[PDB]
């Protein structure tokens, strides 16, 4: 090892005496050991792109070869940690140096080698067992929520020569040692994986289970699945935090991985303040979400090669926790700020531009990234199954979905929750547009619904029809004068507003509307569409009978039924049980049926 | 320290453009500082730009005129650009390279700081809370600025953004609830009339003791324009995070900085980027705009106010477009309001402050701030629409409630926006003017003010 | 069936030899074992983008939007391996599948593809948003070998005239539909409403088919005539008279 510096011109260092140095390997330049990466070889010389500031590097300085590309450390110490695109432990730099800056050429391990971890081996394993790549051979009790499963790296195999008893070990002790063909491998609690390589699985399964968020919209009208791909608009004043807060607090996920890819300086200071404050309830107790969450945090002035490799660090962490058997949901905030760092890294290398200056390989990257999500059957013996759900965020200039990044990401992803600012200014929350949003996972969730909530899909189609009809009846009510209104259309324009105001609108600052279970959702939609059906038939039967019914009689014969409909969304799911709310909704149904028979 | 003697080289091997290529340099160090002595005796200064083996490429600040390859000497300093910094720099005028141009001595140093600086740890920065009071009601009252924000001013050529910058500089301070404050001013690429105006206006309005002025002129070396904002921000960081003051940093015409960046890029033989400017201009602007904010454990802040001129009045030119991706909000200096003889010509409809919600409220300015601002914005937009309809419908066929939205317009532009270049209005005077304007409409038309506040502040 | 699957997380530079492996297999099965092969090449856009990436890697002359200047001569070595030969009883029918960026048909990929292939089938977004299947827009569609494959003894004597008349009527209907968006519903003539009726009945009866329905070509021609009987036989100015005398009254 130990080449030397031959020339420096900007961020580009040239190193001599680097004979056996691989491409895209990482190196440390100078006496402060700045981190850089090899981008070209020529004879005995290597061309290095340095990530930090090269100001002060002289000729003859050392160059240390690391031997591996950009990789991540995977072991106990990830939950509640705060990293960046290079996986530097920000909250440990902050406390070991006692300065408010990130030092230049700082070399600290991502997982601390001081904590003693509680490790218990697999009770069936003994000297002579046949263990392959992926097998869980121990468990570290990370915290009260997450059990950390110790797995063999995906490429090893052999017979157990030694396995450690239960006890306390740090992430440097040899906990396993196996043998193959006369060669020994020692393995500790931490394994290293390159971030640009997909982790192996046994098979990629189709996604057929819902991702419960807790909002009535996004769970009825635009469903996502466990293993899916979503995209939202990341803009100012659109009410965007509902998505990440719902995912973190009330969701069926086990592990959460949040990624900022070059956010503003004060926008990161808000996430790093809010996220350690959210809480969940588990087994009756209240715990912090940072017991099952990891954050990757970059700002606009951090190295451009960390604002680009952030997405890969995040997806590798989530693929590491998917291989244990968990269901992970990753969230990448402002994927556009990643695409811009991509374009800038290209520009530095003097590469031919493509449409709008972005590199040639933009759609290839954006597609091979989202192809890393999904449900899988995990490699290894104890027969588990995991999942990774990716939620990206795009920032189109002025709400224009023609930028190359927005066009590509809308071509790829299957769901699209369209947050709107217009609805936010009207105090309509969650401000989802319901007219430009979509979801193409609705045919995969068909055995699930038909097995668990049989009478739901018809209600979904009916509600979508009603909400579309109230909208394409707009010029009819403006260019004409609200009077030439067939009674079917009066019934629509009233019940659709009932839906818009008492189903699609939810308020998190309450004790009853933070979380809406799905039985409550299907009940609240069934009562509304059943009303609609009965009130529509009552009118269109007595069409020519000299007893013309109009909405004016329907709104006077049932003046409390309508209130109780508009009051369905106050039934607490905790202070009232599930059978109680079911019986209340059934009573309201029978009262509706009565008060509709006592009208004919 | 550095106790080894320095080396002088008489081995110039090439001269072209602003670059001198020297050979037989012992261990050339990148970005080093060099002192050249010309054949007759004049002394110039330079910086190492490229290094290769035993060969250095020095960029000379004052040009390469009269330099030959047989009698010019180059003495190598041994280190990089470190500037001296102390608290006595408040009340002084330096040029772009940091030497005194106000008939005073050199800075006696409290420390020597590297002007490139290190990035702030994203985990130590905290959220901006209180208010920075500029004394201009168009900004204070409706586009409030928080302690730690970064909010630019967008203007064009001929518009009066330098006088707005000067008024902000000589009025800004902290809100007087019921003062550790300093200003660092960086003027880049200004002509001589602008520089004269700044210098004299600051030093004769009795305020040049909480100001540090860095003046860079259009005929100065174009490398000094690259290091001017980094000296300004190094001084600001010293003041705010070691002496615990509240610093406001004003940087005038970042477009000239971008032009100097383009020049020193093309000197490296780099192929141009989109529309002229280098491909790495985002990172270079971000290493400037992100040297700001509040931090944990210190009682000081840094607030930044970049000022730009939009070429061709375009909002999608690379410089405004990239400054929008790093900063939080914008102020707009308008040309229709300038031609109508309104000062300051600030258009409040396109302007925005992304962190106003944090700067205003109870205990910071007053409990009625947000509602007064919302109602003034609403009434102004409605009055503009009414003045549009008046031109086709006729002024004799307007309602009585549309005749109120047309008196509010005149009174708002002539009494609230239009201020006066030497008139200092505290936040409370601004809000009282807002209420004097809102009392044109009956209490029942002010829809955006909650009734619990229309009871305390309307009847006066 | 013989599948050659290169997915989105696979080597990019190996997308350059996948269609050539497929087509070598096809040529062996067709011109030596004498079978009738049907080749489906999915997302020639990804092939073209891998080609652009390899071209930019070694700094070659670009064409429009950065694609190499030899993209025509490269796509033509793939598309031109399809046809029949003299003395052998096989064939190769190619059906590439494209995705046009931003629905633009002037992009280099569709534009260079349309100069090489013998027609194209245009899949429209405006018809997808109306829940129409198959969402095929017949005006930007074309097949260059139709004139020699239809007619007497091949399908039926009237095929070509019905096709041309349906084209003319569809174009005039789409003109009227855009005139009425400016001049309003009540400024149209008695014939513009005939065209606006033809448009609806055509888009809902002829195009819209259902995803498992197999219409013999005579059923298609009967539907076409049922659509052409909306107009008096003097508006059908592309059909000769001796065809209207035999096929229009029925």
């Amino acid at each position: 090892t130990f080449g030397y510096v031959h020339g420096v011109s900007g961020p580009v260092v040239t190193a001599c005496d680097m004979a056996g140095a691989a491409m895209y390997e990482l190196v440390r330049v100078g006496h402060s050991e700045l981190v850089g990466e090899i981008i070209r070889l020529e004879g005995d010389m290597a061309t290095i792109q340095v990530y930090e500031e090269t100001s002060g590097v002289s000729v003859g300085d050392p160059v240390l070869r690391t031997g591996k590309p950009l990789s991540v450390e995977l072991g106990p110490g990830i939950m509640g940690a705060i990293f960046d695109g290079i996986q530097r432990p920000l909250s440990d730099i902050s406390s070991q140096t006692q300065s408010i800056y990130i030092p230049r050429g700082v070399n600290v391990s991502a997982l601390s080698r001081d904590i003693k971890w509680d490790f218990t081996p697999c009770k069936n394993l003994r000297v002579g067992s046949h263990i392959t790549g992926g097998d869980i051979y121990g468990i570290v009790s990370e915290n009260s929520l997450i059990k950390h499963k110790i797995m063999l790296p995906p490429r090893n195999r052999g017979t157990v020569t030694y396995i450690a008893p239960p006890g306390n070990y740090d992430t440097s002790d040899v906990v396993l040692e196996l043998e193959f063909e006369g060669v020994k491998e020692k393995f500790t609690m931490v394994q290293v994986w390159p971030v640009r390589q997909v982790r192996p699985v046994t098979e990629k399964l189709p996604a057929n289970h819902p991702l419960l968020t807790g909002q009535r919209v996004l769970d009825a009208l635009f469903p996502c699945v466990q293993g899916g791909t979503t995209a939202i608009p990341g803009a100012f004043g659109c009410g965007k935090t509902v998505i990440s807060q719902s995912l973190s607090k009330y969701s069926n996920s086990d592990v959460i991985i949040y990624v900022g890819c070059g956010e503003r300086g004060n926008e990161m200071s808000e996430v790093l303040r809010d996220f350690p404050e959210l809480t969940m309830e588990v087994d009756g107790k209240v715990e912090s979400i940072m017991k099952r969450t990891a954050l990757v945090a970059n700002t606009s002035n951090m190295p451009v090669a960390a604002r680009e490799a952030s997405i890969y660090t995040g997806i590798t962490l989530s693929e590491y926790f998917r291989d244990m058997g968990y269901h992970v949901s990753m969230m990448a905030d402002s994927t556009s700020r990643w695409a811009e760092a991509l374009r800038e890294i290209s520009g530095r290398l003097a590469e031919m531009p493509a449409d709008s200056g972005y590199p040639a390989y933009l759609g290839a990257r954006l597609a091979s990234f989202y192809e890393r999500a999904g449900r899988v059957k995990c490699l290894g013996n104890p027969e588990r199954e995991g999942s990774v759900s990716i939620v990206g965020a795009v920032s189109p200039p002025g709400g224009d979905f023609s930028d190359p990044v927005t066009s590509a990401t809308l071509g790829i992803v299957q769901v699209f929750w369209g947050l709107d600012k217009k609805l936010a200014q009207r105090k309509h929350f969650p401000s989802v547009n319901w007219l430009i949003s979509y979801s193409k996972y609705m045919r995969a969730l068909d055995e699930y619904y038909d097995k668990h909530f049989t009478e739901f899909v018809p209600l979904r189609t009916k509600a979508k029809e009603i909400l579309q009809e109230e909208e394409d009846l707009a010029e009819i009510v403006q260019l004409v004068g609200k009077a030439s209104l067939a009674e079917t259309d009066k019934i629509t324009l009233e019940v659709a507003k009932l839906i818009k105001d008492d189903f699609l609108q939810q308020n998190g600052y309450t004790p009853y509307d933070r979380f809406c279970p799905f039985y409550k959702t299907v009940g609240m939609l069934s009562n509304m569409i059943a009303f609609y059906d009965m009130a529509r038939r009552a009118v269109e039967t007595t069409a020519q009978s000299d007893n013309k019914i109009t909405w004016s009689i329907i709104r006077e014969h049932m003046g409390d039924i309508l209130y109780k409909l508009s009051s369905m969304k106050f039934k607490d799911p905790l202070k009232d049980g599930e059978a109680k709310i079911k019986s209340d909704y059934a009573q309201l149904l029978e009262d509706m049926q009565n008060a509709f028979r006592s009208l004919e | 320290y550095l106790s080894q003697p320095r080396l002088t080289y008489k081995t110039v091997s090439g001269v072209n453009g602003p670059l001198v290529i020297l050979d037989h340099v012992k261990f050339p160090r990148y970005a080093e500082i060099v002192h050249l002595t010309l054949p007759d005796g004049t002394k110039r200064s330079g910086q190492v730009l490229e290094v290769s083996g035993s060969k250095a490429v020095v960029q000379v600040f004052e040009g390469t005129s009269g330099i030959d390859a047989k009698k010019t000497s180059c003495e190598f300093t041994g280190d990089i650009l470190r500037t001296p910094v102390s608290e006595d720099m408040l009340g002084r005028v330096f040029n772009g390279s940091g030497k005194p141009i106000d008939r005073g001595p050199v800075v006696l140093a409290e420390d020597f700081l590297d002007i490139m600086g290190q990035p702030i740890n994203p985990q130590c920065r905290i959220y901006p809370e209180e208010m920075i009071q500029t004394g201009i009601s168009a900004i204070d009252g409706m586009n409030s600025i928080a302690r730690g924000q970064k909010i630019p001013i967008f203007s064009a050529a001929g518009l009066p953004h330098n006088e707005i910058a000067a008024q902000i500089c000589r009025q800004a301070g902290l809100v007087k609830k019921s003062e550790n404050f300093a200003i660092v001013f960086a003027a880049m690429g200004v002509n001589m009339e602008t520089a004269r105006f700044f210098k004299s206006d600051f030093e004769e309005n009795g305020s040049m003791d909480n100001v540090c002025l860095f003046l860079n002129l259009a005929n100065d070396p174009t490398i000094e324009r690259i290091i001017t904002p980094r000296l300004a921000l190094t001084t600001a960081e010293f003041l705010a995070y070691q002496c615990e003051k509240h610093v406001l940093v004003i940087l005038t015409d970042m477009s000239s900085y971008a032009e100097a960046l383009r020049e020193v890029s093309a000197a490296r033989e780099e192929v141009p980027g989109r529309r002229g400017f280098p491909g790495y201009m985002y990172t270079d602007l971000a290493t400037i705009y992100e040297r700001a904010g509040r931090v944990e454990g210190r009682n000081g802040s840094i607030t930044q106010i970049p000022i730009l001129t939009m070429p061709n009045d375009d909002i999608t030119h690379p410089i405004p477009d990239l400054t929008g991706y790093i900063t939080e909000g914008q102020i707009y200096v308008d040309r229709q309001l300038h031609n109508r003889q309104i000062y300051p010509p600030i258009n409040v409809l396109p302007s925005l402050s992304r962190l106003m919600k944090s700067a205003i409220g109870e205990g910071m300015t007053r409990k009625d701030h947000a509602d007064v601002s919302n109602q003034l914005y609403a009434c102004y937009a409605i009055g503009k629409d009414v003045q549009a309809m008046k031109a086709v419908v006729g002024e004799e066929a307007l309602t009585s409630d549309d005749l109120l939205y047309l008196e509010f317009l005149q009174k708002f532009e002539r009494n609230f926006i239009a201020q006066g270049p030497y008139e200092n209005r505290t936040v409370f005077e601004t809000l009282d003017i807002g209420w004097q304007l809102l009392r044109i409409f009956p209490k029942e038309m002010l829809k955006r003010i909650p009734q619990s506040t229309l009871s305390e502040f309307y009847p006066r | 069936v013989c599948l050659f699957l290169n997915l989105a997380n696979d080597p990019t530079i190996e997308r350059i030899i996948t269609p050539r492996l497929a087509l070598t297999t096809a040529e062996f099965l067709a011109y030596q074992c004498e079978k009738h092969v049907l080749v489906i090449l999915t997302d020639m856009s990804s092939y073209a983008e891998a080609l652009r990436e390899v071209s930019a890697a070694r700094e070659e002359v670009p064409g429009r939007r950065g694609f190499p200047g030899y993209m025509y001569t490269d796509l033509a070595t793939i598309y031109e391996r399809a046809g029949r030969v003299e003395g052998r009883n096989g064939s190769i029918t190619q059906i590439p599948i494209l995705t046009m960026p931003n629905d633009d048909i002037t992009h280099p990929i569709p534009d260079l593809t349309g100069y090489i292939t013998e027609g194209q089938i245009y899949v429209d977004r405006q018809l997808h948003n109306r829940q129409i299947y198959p969402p095929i827009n017949v005006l930007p569609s074309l097949s260059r070998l139709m004139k020699s494959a239809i007619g007497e003894g091949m399908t039926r004597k009237d095929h070509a005239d019905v096709s041309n008349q349906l084209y003319a009527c569809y174009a005039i209907g789409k003109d009227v539909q855009a005139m009425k968006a400016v001049v309003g519903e009540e400024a149209l003539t008695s014939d513009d409403l005939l065209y606006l009726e033809f448009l609806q009945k055509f888009e809902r009866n002829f195009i819209a088919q259902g995803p498992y329905e197999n219409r013999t070509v005579f059923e298609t021609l009967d539907i076409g005539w049922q659509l052409l009987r909306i107009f008096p036989k003097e508006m059908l100015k592309r059909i000769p008279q001796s065809t209207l005398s035999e096929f229009y009254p029925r």
Binding site: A350, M352, P353 | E269, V271, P272 | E59, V61, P62
Partner: peptide, 18 residues
């Protein structure tokens, strides 16, 4: 862009082969 990259490539070919 392509023309300027060609000029620079020819520069860095000449200076190295000479």
């Amino acid at each position: 862009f392509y023309r300027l990259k060609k000029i620079q490539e020819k520069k860095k070919i000449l200076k190295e082969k000479s």
